[PDB]
Each structure stands twice: as C-alpha cells, then as structure tokens.
C-alpha cells in the first residue's frame, strides 16, 4: 500500500464580515416585478444565511444548478444577483438553462453555464384578483431571442409583415406585451407563481458573500485540513516569499492546483504543501 500522513486539525478562514444579507427584502416584498422587466438586485459584502430561505412558504421549486442547497452555507461566492418576477404555473419549467418558450426567448433567458439556484412558490393568495390581476405582463413578440440576463422594456409596436404600422396596432401589427389574467379560480398551471433566481459566481476576485461558517485560529507547520473562503483542501501551510501583487489572491501550479493562498483576514500569503506521502 501507500502511506500518508493524516490531518490533526481543521481550520476555516472566512472574511471578518458582520452584516447580514438583505434576503428578507428580496423575498418578503409587497410586490414583484413583471417578468418582462424582472427586478435585479446586487447582493455583496454580507453574510448570506440561507437557512432562513425556507421560512418563506412551502417552496414549490428550489432547483440549484452547479451547487446543492444543503451545502449553500459552506460556500463563499463573490457576487450574488437576485432576479425576482412573477410567472404562471406551467411556465415555471422555462426558468432553467437551455430552455425555450415565451419566457426563455422574449422575457428571461438563463445562460447555458448557469450556476446558482431557482426558487418558485405559489402566490395565488397574494397576486390574484377576482376581476383579474393585470399588473403582470409578458412579452409575446420580438425580432430575436434574448441574450442571457438581458432585459427588454421596449414597448414599440411589433411589425411582423412588410406593411408598416405607423405606430398603430391592428392586423399584422401586434402589441409586444400581453398581460396575465390571474384569478383565484384559475388552475394550478395558470395561477401566479413568484420566482426568485440567485446567480452566484465563484473564485476570481475576493469573495464578498459567505455562509455563517465560524473562522478558527490559523495554525502553520502542521498537516491540517483548511478551508479558505470555500477553498477546501489538506496540507501544511507555511510562510511565503512570493511577490503576491495586492490584487492577487491565490496562486496555481503547472497542474492548476492551488499552491499559494492569501489569508482572508490577515492578508498574508501561505504556501500549501501536500502532507508527506509515498509508497511502502
């Protein structure tokens, strides 16, 4: 067999951040934007506690692409983008990477490389009128499909055929937007659903959002498990002589393996050396 050294301690180094991310105002909002003009909010420089997310209704969908919900408290993303809107029931399947349809093409398109989470919950008791909730509209006609995360709020009359419209609707000249008719008596596939899309991006720049993972003391010259801003690994941390430029955070080897890391708190450089190992 092959002998290896086993770790003795586990250390976590997270940024010294106290503020709590404003997920309550994103989720417990009085109104949600229309799908064609979905509301985008930037979340950064705060501690993101997702353990409270489930505290807003019995989630109908919590599909996470690239990560898992149970692990969301152990990661350190860089920027969070929260896009909130309202759609219908059967249309909720269109909010996913590599999808097609009315919402995917003309309202909200998710890139194929999407990494994040999608939340949808039924909101028939909030966004339905017995006479019809006409506050929510979706685009029905466009020249071409949308680029990922592109918002189209134009309301110009759509010209389909060769006949000019001159700004007057009618045959061959349809109004681009069509309004939802949410009612309390509609079917589940037609009832309103509130959708919040979180778009994480990892690595690169220093992480500004992090989970509620406590940071322990930093120990060097020992074979330990380490977790630097979501970067997990095993090895021995040692002082570095590297000319790490101020912006540079971590260094890579020939095999693109993290070999030097900048401590998120002390802003000091640490070389990572794999624990002694070999064959017998």
């Amino acid at each position: 067999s092959n002998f290896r050294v086993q770790p003795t301690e586990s250390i976590v180094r997270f940024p010294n951040i106290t503020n709590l991310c404003p997920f309550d105002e994103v989720f417990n909002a009085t109104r949600f934007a229309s799908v064609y003009a979905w509301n985008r909010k930037r979340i950064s420089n705060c501690v993101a506690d997702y353990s409270v997310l489930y505290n807003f209704a019995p989630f109908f969908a919590f599909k996470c692409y690239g990560v898992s919900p149970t692990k969301l408290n152990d990661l350190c993303f860089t920027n969070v983008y929260a896009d909130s809107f309202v759609i219908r029931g059967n249309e909720v399947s269109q909010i996913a990477p590599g999808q097609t349809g009315n919402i995917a093409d003309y309202n909200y398109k998710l890139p194929d490389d999407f990494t994040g989470c999608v939340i949808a919950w039924n909101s028939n008791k909030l966004d339905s009128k017995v006479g019809g909730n006409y506050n929510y509209q979706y685009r029905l006609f466009r020249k071409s499909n949308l680029k990922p995360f592109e918002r189209d709020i134009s309301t110009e009359i759509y010209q389909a055929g060769n006949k000019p419209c001159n700004g007057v609707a009618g045959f061959n000249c349809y109004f681009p937007l069509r309004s939802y008719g949410f009612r309390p008596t509609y079917g589940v596939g037609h009832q309103p659903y509130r959708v919040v899309v979180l778009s994480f991006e990892l690595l690169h720049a220093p992480a500004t959002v992090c989970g509620p993972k406590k940071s322990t003391n930093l120990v060097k010259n020992k074979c330990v498990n380490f977790n630097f801003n979501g970067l997990t690994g095993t090895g021995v941390l040692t002082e570095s002589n590297k000319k790490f430029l101020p912006f540079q955070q971590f260094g890579r080897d020939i095999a693109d393996t993290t070999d030097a890391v900048r401590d998120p708190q002390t802003l000091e450089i640490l070389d990572i050396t794999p624990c002694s190992f070999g064959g017998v």
Partner: antibody
Amino acid sequence: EVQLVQSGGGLVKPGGSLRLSCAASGFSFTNAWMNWVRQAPGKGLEWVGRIKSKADGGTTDYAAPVKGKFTISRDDSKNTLYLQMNSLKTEDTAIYYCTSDVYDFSTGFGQRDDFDYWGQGTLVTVSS
Amino acid sequence: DIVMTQSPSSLSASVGDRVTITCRASQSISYFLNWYQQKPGKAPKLLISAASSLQSGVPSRFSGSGSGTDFTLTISSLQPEDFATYYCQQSYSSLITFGGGTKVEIK
C-alpha cells in the same frame, strides 16, 4: 404635461341623457385605462365604471347602481373618453371625474388599477 | 361588492403631529388598496399605491403599511397643507369601492 379636459356637463330633466367627454393629452391614451368617478355633493367618492385599453380587450365594468343605465365608450383616434348616461333619476347628481390608470412599462412595478391622473371634474345636475 | 370602512372620520391634529388613519376591508384584499387626498374644492390626488408604495411627487412624510384586512396611513409630521379628506380605495374586486372618507382638520 398630462391634461384631461372635460366637457358636456350640465343640468337635465329627470329621464334625460347627457354625453360627457374627457379629452386626454400629454400621455399615450391607447395604453391607459380610463375610469369614471363621481362625488355626490357633500359625500364621499363613488366609482361609476371602467373601460380597459384596446390591448386588454376593452371590456367595460360598471357599478351596481349604474350597470343598466350608463355606457362608457372611448376613441383612441382623438384621445377622448365618453360616458353616456340615460334614464336618470334624482340621485345621479354629482361631480364626475375622468381618471386614468397609466401603466409604467419601464420600471416594471406598474399598477393597473390606480387613478394616476384626474380630470378637473364637471358638474351634472338632475332636476325638474 | 366589498364592504369597506374607515376609522376614524373626524380626527384632527395640530402642526407637527402624528396622524394614523385605519382602513378595514370586509375580506382579504392582499395589497390592492390605494390612498387618495382630496382638498376642499379640488380633484383628489393619489398618495399611496398598493397600500405600501409612495407615489412620485408625494412628500416622504406619508407612509403606508398593512396587508390582509387592516391597512394604515401614517403622517409623521403634520403640516398646514396636510389638512384634507383622505380616502382608501380597494381594487381587489372588479367592482371598485371607495372608503367612507376621513376629514383631518385643525384645532
């Protein structure tokens, strides 16, 4: 500037008919719902009816006391809204306002059933 | 139709005072409630939309809150130009009904 000039108000005998007009300017009349609201002398506001935009089907809703007597019409050509009332009684006297339900297509948070802009109001009196 | 009641209907206060107007609906109307201000001899003006959103051009001293069957309009610091009649209007149903009307006067 958004303006809603009204005309056609006046006095009428019981059982008569008048044709109120409300000409809109300064905004896209096509995309805005138009509602009629009346205020009895010394009383609170009462809702008369509503006509939706042509892009939403143009269905017309009326209050219970005025369902079978009033008729709300619109013409996008001259950006004008019309309220036709017939078979009046002594209880229909009030100051009638024409109101709009402009929808903000840009921001996204645009209400559709809020009286954003109001006309100056015209006085309609029913007497012998 | 939905029965809609205001409370109170004769409240008065002086300048630099806090005023709260309560508006109760006969059934759950979610957030479809609007607050209007009518000065004597003038057309009404929209103040609060969706029962929690300030309208553009309205001073920040007007605030809306509540949901379900209870709504409240709060004026933090009353002003000489804030004496008027306030109406709460529901849009949950197709038959829109206004409130009873609250008159805010001076002492």
